[PDB]
Design a protein around this motif. Sequence first.
Motif, PDB file in Angstrom:
ATOM      1  N   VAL A  74      11.129   1.798  -1.273  1.00 53.00           N
ATOM      2  CA  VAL A  74      12.042   2.720  -1.941  1.00 53.00           C
ATOM      3  C   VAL A  74      13.254   3.003  -1.050  1.00 53.00           C
ATOM      4  CG1 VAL A  74      12.345   5.155  -2.553  1.00 53.00           C
ATOM      5  CG2 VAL A  74      10.466   3.836  -3.547  1.00 53.00           C
ATOM      6  N   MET A  75      13.004   3.201   0.242  1.00 50.77           N
ATOM      7  CA  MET A  75      14.077   3.407   1.210  1.00 50.77           C
ATOM      8  C   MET A  75      14.976   2.181   1.280  1.00 50.77           C
ATOM      9  SD  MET A  75      12.244   5.234   4.456  1.00 50.77           S
ATOM     10  CE  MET A  75      13.508   4.447   5.457  1.00 50.77           C
TER      11      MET A  75
ATOM     12  N   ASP B 225       0.787  -1.228   0.000  1.00 48.30           N
ATOM     13  CA  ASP B 225       0.000   0.000   0.000  1.00 48.30           C
ATOM     14  C   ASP B 225       0.819   1.278   0.000  1.00 48.30           C
ATOM     15  OD1 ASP B 225       1.013   0.035   2.625  1.00 48.30           O
ATOM     16  OD2 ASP B 225      -0.874  -0.619   3.516  1.00 48.30           O
TER      17      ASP B 225
ATOM     18  N   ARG C 239      20.974  11.172   5.742  1.00 49.86           N
ATOM     19  CA  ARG C 239      19.863  10.914   4.827  1.00 49.86           C
ATOM     20  C   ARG C 239      18.629  11.766   5.127  1.00 49.86           C
ATOM     21  NH1 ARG C 239      17.823   5.480   4.332  1.00 49.86           N
ATOM     22  NH2 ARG C 239      17.479   5.931   2.109  1.00 49.86           N
TER      23      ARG C 239
ATOM     24  N   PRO D 217       8.020   5.887   7.234  1.00 52.01           N
ATOM     25  CA  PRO D 217       6.632   6.326   7.394  1.00 52.01           C
ATOM     26  C   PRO D 217       5.913   5.722   8.600  1.00 52.01           C
ATOM     27  CG  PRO D 217       6.694   4.540   5.840  1.00 52.01           C
ATOM     28  CD  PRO D 217       8.123   4.737   6.317  1.00 52.01           C
ATOM     29  N   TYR D 218       6.656   5.218   9.581  1.00 53.89           N
ATOM     30  CA  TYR D 218       6.038   4.503  10.697  1.00 53.89           C
ATOM     31  C   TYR D 218       6.387   5.066  12.074  1.00 53.89           C
ATOM     32  CZ  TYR D 218       5.281   0.877   7.121  1.00 53.89           C
ATOM     33  OH  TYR D 218       4.921   0.188   5.986  1.00 53.89           O
TER      34      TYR D 218
ATOM     35  N   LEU E 249       1.939   3.332   2.237  1.00 51.09           N
ATOM     36  CA  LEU E 249       3.133   3.437   3.073  1.00 51.09           C
ATOM     37  C   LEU E 249       4.183   2.359   2.810  1.00 51.09           C
ATOM     38  CD1 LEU E 249       1.502   4.344   6.517  1.00 51.09           C
ATOM     39  CD2 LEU E 249       2.592   5.882   4.861  1.00 51.09           C
ATOM     40  N   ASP E 250       3.745   1.166   2.412  1.00 52.79           N
ATOM     41  CA  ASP E 250       4.673   0.101   2.030  1.00 52.79           C
ATOM     42  C   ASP E 250       5.582   0.584   0.905  1.00 52.79           C
ATOM     43  OD1 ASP E 250       4.513  -2.225   3.648  1.00 52.79           O
ATOM     44  OD2 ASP E 250       2.555  -2.719   2.788  1.00 52.79           O
TER      45      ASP E 250
ATOM     46  N   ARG F 188       4.488  -3.485  11.908  1.00 50.48           N
ATOM     47  CA  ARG F 188       5.242  -2.428  11.240  1.00 50.48           C
ATOM     48  C   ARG F 188       4.880  -1.062  11.813  1.00 50.48           C
ATOM     49  NH1 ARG F 188       2.276  -0.778   5.641  1.00 50.48           N
ATOM     50  NH2 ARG F 188       0.206  -1.682   6.044  1.00 50.48           N
TER      51      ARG F 188
ATOM     52  N   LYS G 222      14.753  10.845   4.477  1.00 52.00           N
ATOM     53  CA  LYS G 222      14.715   9.537   3.845  1.00 52.00           C
ATOM     54  C   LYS G 222      14.942   8.448   4.848  1.00 52.00           C
ATOM     55  CE  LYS G 222      14.586   8.684   0.042  1.00 52.00           C
ATOM     56  NZ  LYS G 222      13.570   8.478  -1.015  1.00 52.00           N
TER      57      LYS G 222
ATOM     58  N   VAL H 195       6.612   3.619   0.296  1.00 54.40           N
ATOM     59  CA  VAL H 195       7.626   4.524   0.832  1.00 54.40           C
ATOM     60  C   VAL H 195       8.820   3.773   1.422  1.00 54.40           C
ATOM     61  CG1 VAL H 195       8.130   6.243   2.609  1.00 54.40           C
ATOM     62  CG2 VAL H 195       5.990   6.377   1.313  1.00 54.40           C
ATOM     63  N   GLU H 196       8.532   2.751   2.220  1.00 47.66           N
ATOM     64  CA  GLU H 196       9.570   1.998   2.919  1.00 47.66           C
ATOM     65  C   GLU H 196      10.414   1.137   1.981  1.00 47.66           C
ATOM     66  OE1 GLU H 196      10.990   2.200   5.633  1.00 47.66           O
ATOM     67  OE2 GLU H 196      11.225   0.338   6.762  1.00 47.66           O
TER      68      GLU H 196
END
Lengths: 75, 76, 407, 405
Positions: free
Chosen positions: A43-44, A35, C125, C132-133, A37-38, C67, C128, A40-41
């Motif tokens: 790519v990181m 989804d 970074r 998002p958590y 947010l998945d 997560r 980056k 985003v992580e």
Amino acid sequence: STIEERVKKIIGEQLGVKQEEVTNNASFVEDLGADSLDTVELVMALEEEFDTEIPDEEAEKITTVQAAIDYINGH
Amino acid sequence: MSTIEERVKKIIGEQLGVKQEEVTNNASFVEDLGADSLDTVELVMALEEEFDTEIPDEEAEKITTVQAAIDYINGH
Amino acid sequence: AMKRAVITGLGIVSSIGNNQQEVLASLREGRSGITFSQELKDSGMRSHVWGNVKLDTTGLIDRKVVRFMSDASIYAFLSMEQAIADAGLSPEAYQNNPRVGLIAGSGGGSPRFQVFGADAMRGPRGLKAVGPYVVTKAMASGVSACLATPFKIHGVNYSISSACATSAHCIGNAVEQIQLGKQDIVFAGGGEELCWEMACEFDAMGALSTKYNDTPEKASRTYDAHRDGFVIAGGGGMVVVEELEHALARGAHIYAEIVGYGATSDGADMVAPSGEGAVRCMKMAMHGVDTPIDYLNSHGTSTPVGDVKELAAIREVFGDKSPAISATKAMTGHSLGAAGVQEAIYSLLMLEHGFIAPSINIEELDEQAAGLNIVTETTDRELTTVMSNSFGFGGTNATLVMRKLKD
Amino acid sequence: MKRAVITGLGIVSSIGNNQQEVLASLREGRSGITFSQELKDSGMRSHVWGNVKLDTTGLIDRKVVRFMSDASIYAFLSMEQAIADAGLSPEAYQNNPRVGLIAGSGGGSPRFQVFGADAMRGPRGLKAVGPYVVTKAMASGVSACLATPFKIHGVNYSISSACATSAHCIGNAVEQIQLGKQDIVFAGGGEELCWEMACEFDAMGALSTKYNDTPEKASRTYDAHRDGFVIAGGGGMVVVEELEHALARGAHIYAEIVGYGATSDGADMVAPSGEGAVRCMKMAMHGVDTPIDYLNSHGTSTPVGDVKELAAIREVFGDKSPAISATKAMTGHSLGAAGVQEAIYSLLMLEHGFIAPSINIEELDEQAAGLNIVTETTDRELTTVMSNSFGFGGTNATLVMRKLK
Ligand SMILES: */C=C\C(=O)NCCNC(=O)CCNC(=O)[C@@H](O)C(C)(C)COP(*)(=O)O
Ligand SMILES: */C=C\C(=O)NCCNC(=O)CCNC(=O)[C@@H](O)C(C)(C)COP(*)(=O)O
């Protein structure tokens, strides 16, 4: 022996799926249940692996196995 | 001419929020002034900022009185 | 007639056990859950002792759910899984149900991940590195948010926060939801992470034990003449709070009825308790309860200032007819936000299995603790009514009274 | 059963430091959003915020502020305002078991949690930390730091529910009155404004980033080209009071709280499901015989969030939709403080008979079409108003307020 096929490995870890289910033209959202947010992580995670920054509107519209591998080659 | 002599009083004054004249040298922090055990901690800290020294725990709680503070700095 | 509330299930992850059986054994034995902590020592703290959870949590929770979670949410989540199974509730019974809710919180959210987030931002970074958590882990409502979503909760959903009284107020609030007729079931509890990021803040206050690092299991010592502060701890707990007729009729197993809930404020000192507030709190919880209190799980954190004030308040409430008293924090350490619900669970086990856990490490009983029936050896007894106190900074007070159901 | 009314209020927000200033801004459609050096210097992509414009220096006694973070400071100042506005004196509310306080923040104080860690890892170590970090940083800081100086003896704790926080605080206050446990409850919340917390939201992609050069345009609820919310800070407090208690002292009554909704999605962690919001609004409207005249929508100016609520609104009201404006277009998103502030905005509108505009709607969203979304200040006699608050974890809160008659 290291290829560049780990992108598959990284995607696998992040999305928590079985390596065979990762298949080059498999979509992150529509096939691997990733989804908002998945995205985003992952790519990181593709940056921790493979020392390389990916710009925001570069790393978006990536979205399928293919284009993750594609991008990273020559980077 | 004279560089100041023991503005310790000032630190205590501002820390405990008093009018400078109330800081008597025989004035104890708790029974007068009105500091609680958390006020004490901050005051010990403030005395370290000023006076660029550190004060060990078992030293800092022999300090109660305005003098005890003066006493401690002098010779350190 | 007004609605009644009972406990029909529980779950716990604590320093003295990772479920109610392990906890039951530790309680009877008077086993300490306290150990030495390298992490606290390496951080620069004066307190090197811990009430840690002895469990590797890796993989216990689904990827998509964990997560979002800090440790407080994880402990609370695992406790809730236990509580659900223990209540004999099936997914169909409590999920997607507007009359089933959840009230659980922590005392301090997640300092670890708030610090992690700041470090990442200030690192090479920057944005980056954050991910998002962090918000979902760090925010104060994390424990309730991270649980209500995977468990498909549809009723009420939020966190009560009141420092060391947190999960006690959560249970009381859960009770109010049932009394008001708004919910049939409310999951109530809390969790707290264990980390130097938070523990050091307490150490800078002088609130933590520092003189017993070489003998960790002796550090937490409530009512002892030579106590020097509390031992910080982590963990979680959850209880199933349920309307009486809803529970009886689905043939639920009922631990006890909640017959009293007190909630008051000192409005006096920020970090030091006043006698009057606790007295009003206990009296409020005992109101309309015709049986006597057989056992009292005291807040009793093992601080010089705190332990004697609570005893003075107890004396005033009961006078010469004091109930048996033990402080389980002497074994468990201080779980902060999770303390209320865990100590409620301890009291419920004592009530369920007919014994009183010891208040351990009292080498020299304090001058001001005299003549009050403080129990120091495990003691079998048939209990009917028990009481548990939880107090927090800002002069916030909570008391729960629980009692066996009849017939 | 007992009824609950608002008899006083106080607020410190991006569009005013009291109810007079705020009332003026609401009528203006003024924006409280400005450029932020702090957010930019931190490395964020978002540079706009709804900041508090006020020097707090000396406003609070030293022995009291030594325990406080910014969230507590805003809430404390709002509480001072609310008390005076209710015409309450110390004998009326201090040392009184029937007077309590329920106020919280969304995230406590990340600034001081970080400060404590930085101090600890820098030299001096524990000595640099100080004895005041716990009370500033703990989640219950706002309630603990207020109940003590104000001598509160009744209930005392914080509700935390992310962006629905202070709404649940008000709802809980009502329940305390309904249960007969309290005569007065001070209810509200606060939120600090800092990069430490703001950056975590930006890392989610939740914050507006395409309008930095024109801050007042960044927050744009219901516009086709919205890109996330503008973070904000502040506080607010309302005096929630039992009806007969208010009447007997000749209190000024703004409105009765005739409805309170609190529900959960149990679906998605950060995206609303609509189902939960519908149940919430319906729950708040239960037993309310009058219609809803105005609705202060949650409306954060995020792409995903704004229309979800609109879809939920349609389902509840059908063809009889109420007038709607999202004041966050002016105010930005106050997080934990949003619930009580937006309740106050709604009460001001109800008290002075007007509807504040939902501004910056350049192009109305295609899915926002058949509705009464107000874009220009409009005078009207209102009787019943509604305010929605939603938060992460699928938590929902709705308040319905109505004039007493
Ligand atoms: C505190 C947050 C809040 O106000 N929650 C209730 C209102 N809901 C929203 O504003 C919608 C949530 N926002 C989002 O999902 C997105 O902004 C992201 C968080 C950035 C996720 O993007 P995805 O593609 O889902
Ligand atoms: C989380 C805290 C808690 O359990 N609160 C409820 C019981 N209160 C106490 O046990 C008091 C503990 N505080 C202390 O022992 C002192 O270190 C302070 C009060 C923080 C400072 O004391 P001073 O001597 O004024």
